[PDB]
Design a protein around this ligand. Structure first.
Ligand code: NAD
Ligand code: NAD
Ligand code: NAD
Ligand code: NAD
Ligand code: IMP
Ligand code: IMP
Ligand code: IMP
Ligand code: IMP
Lengths: 376, 376, 376, 376
């Protein structure tokens, strides 16, 4: 038995690759399509990967796909749509409080991926501001009975947001909050000590956000979702990644970096459950998609744009492709669960590699005349 | 004789350049058109370079040019075409097993670059899957008498592939296998210990592959073909480089990094020996070229695209240009053989240099109005 | 259950310390009393640590304490003494072959730590030279029935030693050999490929050896026993650490670096089971202790000295102190077995720290007038 | 033959160790007993190593052991003694020119290691000053017919020494000179361009020299004999290492660093062929040994001391031990010649390792009461 008593169970497993901390302490601000994940060993099929992920300290979901509360992406409609497929939705606060109240009533007065509560009503969350008049919003939201709320802000480290956190945690102890936006560990600490139940991480790296180009704030997305998640697991706090998502690759490598759920704003935009309706320009069927920092929210500054993106049909045909993509990525990484993927990442077993710009432009399609890219 | 007794034969030879391990342990994921090879000393003509390279542990070839088994590039046709010019071909498994059987019979029932066996029948290989029903494929392929097989897979480190390797190495001892795809040394170890006779290295970096952009797996190609070849020569195992080939430069610097043969998928596509036939779009005579990970192979995910590329005529006028390109590159590097090129690389004598993006965009044509680029 | 689905089982465990490869790739040639091992977490008592370690690929022992074959330390006497307490002994070859034959017969013709074979005769090994006349030694040793032999040499990488290994592995397949001395991975490879069953690592760092000061060869001991053991576990080969042992600390941190057994030459010298008998100088009861490289082995060069060391009584009172020391060190490191200690070392969980000369001179006793140091 | 066509002849040979330039470009001023040489592979016996080394561009010797011209070590006596055993000697210039003239006549008017010229008279060299009156010395030395001269100086980079080199190279073209002392590459260039035929490298690191402690000049010895030899082989110039020699280890690792011959000042002192005669202090038979920078050479400064060292008998019993030591070190390094040792060093095949102070104090004898160290 001498071949066992040298090391014990584990084979040699040569040291090719870079672990997470030697990748994110080189100082360079890497983003999603700037590194990539090296594979490992698989001993299991694609179908049996369990993507059960946690949203906050008491709310777990069957899929990590959550949506961002903008007025051009989610309502009660894609809320009930993602609640039917395991995710969660948040209702934007850019409306009257009574409209958000009857919106959050419409979803809870309403396929094995459950995401519904103890009394089999659907989990659904919402977004609330941080000004003093927003108390009159979320008290009516509690009468409607919302379960998790998002303290949506450009800067997550205000005196106003931590005062609001102290205002709900004494009044509403069962209710849970989502602090953000944070990008660094200092404001992550300054929210977690206030009693935040989960963070939403990432500012500036949105498909709409130009606040890096306008306010010079923020940081690259992947370094943020690594370091805030690395700090947040010290206290047992999940994080939520926003922005910089264009495909099923970015969300997979995003929650492989320590995130538990990922927040999809543009890639869930222009669906059949999205607000408004379709229109046409140059014969392309597309729906407008607009952030709050654009001046079309209602001496002001603008931190966002107004634009549009082509459609992708219903989510009920779209998010099974997303979970199949997460499912295949967590296959060929080599873990049977997302929890095992983060365990292999923080354990140093799962290894990465930095990627240069030429390997980026060869990572996609190249050296051909024309092509049709259909993902499913 | 004192000028000999200081060092002995060798002159000073100043230390300009970087050797391979100081280039590929900086952590950056370099690819083919991101570094380049510094020249040395030549004392010989272009014609007498011997590009004899090994495919697997008993199969050697007169040229290192092998093709990739897709249904849009090779059949028996370019198999007999590359067997006539020293290479090898593999028949794609995206057909019925009887069609692959009569395909591999058509090539062996059939100009000094030989690549034919002891009984002067042509060397020709094929590709086989990894599912349980594929036993009924490769047993008929053995009745047809194929010599080397490729266990084609997206992820080379499965329990299924090593179980298949154990299934052919006890049944068919003379038959030889090609494991893959691997990109790192760990799965290279986990295939070589099973009894793999040669690897095929490189995933995601294909001209069709978007699985880096979709599944977040893989790594850059040049670092993969350096490190898997650096591990594989410990056990005397050749490797085969796939993807990221656009020209005769990439294959030359690819097999200069430790690869013995290189696998050409797109640059051998759209030939007279390619499947289907030509068609026209915008007046350009081009042939469709499609990978298996595209959904046009037959709830599914897609790891490839369907597209097309312009033609290059017959290979019998094309691969002499490729071997002349390899021949001139191995000239001005300074080695009389590919084996001497790898000996100078692992010995530290042959040296490289990293290249930046501005030196990349000046490496090609620049500072002129228009040009005609004809390679031969 | 959200506190489990972030990481899974494992707590935060901050990154204080250095793992083994970042300690032994800084280039500095660290030795035993130049680094030290940081503690971890214990959840078990001192008595239940299992120090079962492997000698070669089929020979496992209950303690890792083996002795070095010099003519001034071991005979049949300390062979039966260490066989009674789980270890192994080797009989020096600096005698006539008939004397080594009746020595190895005396030990096998002869307290729960067993170290005896299938037919309950004591495991005992011996040492054999490498010259051509030594065939007539080890064939008589096989008639006496020795189980493991040590191809004792100053340089383990000779053509003569690998020819000898090929000479016993075809004649005597059940018999097992110990190659050495090696200090680097190249000669470790050049012995393992010949069929060596276990290495003995470390030259020059002995208490007698001045061959570093005379032949300028060798390397520091701890870097050798890390790197040769790191190479040797690729093929499932144990290593044996010689020299530089003054205390129970050095052997503990020595086999914590990848060694399975450790070879004790001077710290087992001057016992009641040691050759010759005691004598007196300045009223101190001490026994002479001499290596083979001294000119007193029988135009010659000398690689050793002749000297003496004070006594320590019987080993049966001494090696229980040694196993209690190993037992307490493997306690406060935090592993229930030596195999778990090497698993935590190669896994990166067990961490080290380099130590400077001032922390060395404060690591021992300091800042007092006089002291009595009694270890048990 | 595929196992040959991957690399060609050379096996894997793992990358354990440090080559010379990564050891001597870390910036630390390493000396002889601060690093050590890792072994390699041997396929040959000890007796057949050929230590033929070159002194200057036309003078080769059978052993690299030369002596330093002080008035307390060499005369005609140890000149004829080392000429009988292959070396060379130099006669100190601290005498009248007629005394040096009849000294150099006594040696040439006078066992297979030859070191004698074309007309079978003994090779013997001498040392000459650099002041203007020294012309009247070396012209009489040329009438006596000396073959190589040493332009002995504390600082080898004077205008006076290069003017002297221009003064002998036009007058005496067959005569050859030894420039020095140099420690850096700049003064090595400024002597080689003048027409120096070989350098003598190393100031301050002598057993007598306190000019580092007094004039703050010089550098550590091993870095000097690496870098001046690395510059000097660009022009095909041998170098001669002085000082810091206490044993046969230092001269072996000294000429392994690029030196061709090594200059022995103290370890050849106090012999039967040394000047003066023996005397006694505390019952130890010892002979006085004094450098020129001491004030006992004849407002002055002193760069040396006057002292004594115990005897070692005749050199004819002593330098066979030295060549046997060089012979065994060049054995277990793994080269059949000194030229092959320098070829393996500059080729990067021969590798080193830095050594710390604790591994230094364990490199010698330790952990014992008392010992007798006899080297032969
Ligand atoms: N990438 C991102 O995540 C990102 C980045 C920028 C903006 N945004 C979007 O822009 C929206 C608006 O951002 P915003 O926070 O700047 O608008 P806001 O109206 O919520 O706050 C405006 C400013 O007033 C301050 N503030 C907050 N509460 C206050 C109070 N009681 N009294 C006085 N001042 C108070 C804040 O510091 C803020 O700078 C957000 O809903 C967010 O969704 C998102
Ligand atoms: N750049 C590249 O080299 C690259 C990358 C990606 C895909 N591809 C191409 O895509 C093709 C298909 O790739 P694929 O391997 O994902 O498709 P596949 O049908 O061969 O395997 C599908 C999945 O099932 C699993 N599998 C394999 N054998 C199984 C078995 N008996 N039972 C259950 N599951 C099994 C595998 O893990 C795999 O994830 C390949 O032929 C390959 O050529 C190439
Ligand atoms: N720290 C250490 O481990 C260490 C270091 C040095 C020496 N030693 C001790 O010194 C002892 C003697 O060492 P040694 O190997 O130098 O003495 P040796 O008599 O075994 O070998 C002497 C030399 O002859 C060569 N040799 C071996 N077999 C030969 C053969 N058939 N024919 C011709 N030459 C042959 C070897 O290369 C060696 O240099 C060893 O038993 C060893 O225990 C130990
Ligand atoms: N480790 C060493 O190698 C080392 C170091 C220091 C000294 N030494 C010994 O000390 C001895 C004396 O050393 P030294 O060179 O300082 O004594 P020196 O008498 O030869 O020279 C004395 C000084 O005068 C200068 N000099 C040389 N030629 C001159 C000339 N024509 N006119 C005017 N000035 C001139 C020199 O620069 C020197 O500083 C040397 O023989 C040498 O062997 C050896
Ligand atoms: O108006 C805006 N200005 C700046 N950032 C915004 C704005 N609206 C939404 N965002 C961010 O963009 C994210 C959506 O991600 P994306 O659309 O997929 O890039 C949200 O979660 C917000 O963090
Ligand atoms: O469908 C696919 N999805 C991803 N990679 C593919 C697919 N088909 C072929 N490949 C890879 O692409 C390589 C062809 O190289 P290229 O076409 O010259 O870039 C093959 O050897 C495969 O490794
Ligand atoms: O004579 C010798 N010269 C050099 N090394 C020796 C000699 N004799 C024994 N050794 C080494 O010293 C080790 C003993 O370790 P130590 O006595 O505890 O320092 C042995 O295992 C040998 O490797
Ligand atoms: O008087 C002196 N002052 C400083 N260095 C000296 C003196 N005399 C000799 N040396 C140097 O010491 C070397 C002798 O080496 P060692 O005696 O073996 O240390 C000579 O080759 C000179 O370079």
């Amino acid at each position: 038995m001498a071949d066992y008593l040298i090391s014990g169970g584990t084979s040699y497993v040569p040291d090719d690759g870079l672990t997470a901390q030697q990748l994110f302490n080189c100082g360079d601000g890497l983003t999603y399509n700037d590194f990539l994940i090296l594979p490992g060993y698989i001993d299991f099929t694609a179908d049996q990967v369990d993507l059960t992920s946690a949203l906050t300290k008491k709310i777990t979901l069957k899929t990590p796909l959550v949506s961002s509360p903008m007025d051009t992406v989610t309502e009660a409609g894609m809320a009930i749509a993602m609640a039917l497929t395991g995710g969660i939705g948040f209702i934007h606060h850019n409306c009257t409080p009574e409209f958000q109240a009857n919106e959050v009533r419409k979803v809870k007065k309403y396929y094995p991926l459950a995401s519904k509560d103890a009394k089999k009503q659907l989990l659904c969350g919402a977004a609330i501001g941080t000004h003093e008049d927003d108390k009159y919003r979320l008290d009516l939201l509690a009468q409607a009975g919302v379960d998790v709320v998002v303290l949506d802000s450009s800067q997550g480290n205000s005196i106003f947001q931590i005062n609001m956190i102290k205002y709900i945690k004494d009044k509403y102890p069962n209710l849970q909050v989502i602090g953000g936006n944070v990008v660094t560990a200092a404001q992550a600490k300054n929210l977690i000590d206030a009693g935040v139940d989960a963070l939403r991480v990432g500012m500036g790296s949105g498909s709409i956000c130009i606040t890096q180009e306008v306010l010079a704030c923020g940081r690259p997305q992947a370094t943020a979702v690594y370091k805030v998640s690395e700090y947040a697991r010290r206290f047992g706090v999940p994080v939520i990644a926003d922005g910089g998502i264009q495909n099923v690759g970015h969300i997979a490598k995003a929650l492989a970096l320590g995130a538990s759920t990922v927040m999809m704003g543009s890639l869930l935009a222009a669906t059949t459950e999205a607000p408004g309706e379709y229109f046409f320009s140059d014969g392309i069927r597309l729906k407008k998609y607009r952030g709050m920092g654009s001046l079309d929210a209602m001496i002001k500054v603008a931190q966002g744009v107004s634009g549009a993106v082509q459609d992708k049909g219903s989510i009920h045909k779209f998010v099974p492709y997303l979970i199949a993509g997460i499912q295949h990525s967590c296959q060929d990484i080599g873990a049977k669960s997302l929890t095992q993927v983060r365990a292999m990442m923080y354990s140093g077993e799962l290894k990465f590699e930095k990627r240069t710009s030429s390997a980026q432009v060869e990572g996609g399609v190249h050296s051909l005349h024309s092509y049709e890219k259909r993902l499913f």
